[PDB]
Amino acid sequence: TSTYGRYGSQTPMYGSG
Amino acid sequence: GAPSPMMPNEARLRNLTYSAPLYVDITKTVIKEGEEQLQTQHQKTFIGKIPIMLRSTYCL
């Protein structure tokens, strides 16, 4: 239980906002 | 901990004693030679803890 990513959970960008 | 109301069910689950703190107004009044006298009052001095009957006028 340290980094359960499996990629990931849609990382939001900085230049998208 | 930080102060909060005890709920009866928490009091039941933790083997606590469902009770209110109890306080009183005491005048420490005293007099001595020279007609030196004083009546310093300790408002709300703690006396004890009194167990509350569930669903009473003083229950939560």
Binding site: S2, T3, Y4, G5, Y7, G8, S9, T11, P12, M13, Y14, G15, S16 | -
Partner: protein, 139 residues
């Protein structure tokens, strides 16, 4: 080598645990994160200081309004805790960070410094919370 550099790489699932843990400005300062700019390009920025934003944002379940003082060599600006990537340091991005540090005049941190810094995280993880930290956490 971008492989040794990934040991001090802070992923997204690790920050969540340490949102309220003190000593924060002493464990994360010296590691490298994979922050997002935006299209799939990325740059290796430097964790310099611990700043706080006036923007409260939700990170899955958890919410954190803090910022990160990052800087890619000379280009420094404000950052939020949401735009970091779980992706490891690639080859093209590793050489790009090397060129941003050789272009800025900043010294590359010696490998022995990285080896003594990656262990601070594992000792901070296994840290017994015996002191008054749970209190300040719930506050």
């Amino acid at each position: 080598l971008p492989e040794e550099l990934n040991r001090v790489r802070l992923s997204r699932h690790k920050l969540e645990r340490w949102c309220h843990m003190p000593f924060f400005a002493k464990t994360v300062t010296g590691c490298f994160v994979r922050i997002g700019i935006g299209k799939p390009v990325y740059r290796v920025a430097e964790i310099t200081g611990v700043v706080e934003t006036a923007k409260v944002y939700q990170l899955g379940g958890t919410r954190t309004n803090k910022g990160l003082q990052l800087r890619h060599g000379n280009d420094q600006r404000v950052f939020r805790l949401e735009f970091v990537s779980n992706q490891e340091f690639t080859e093209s991005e590793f050489m790009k960070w090397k060129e941003a540090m050789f272009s800025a005049g900043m010294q590359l941190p010696t490998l022995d410094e990285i080896n003594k810094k990656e262990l601070s995280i594992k000792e901070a993880l296994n840290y017994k919370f015996n002191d008054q930290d749970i209190e300040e956490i719930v506050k």
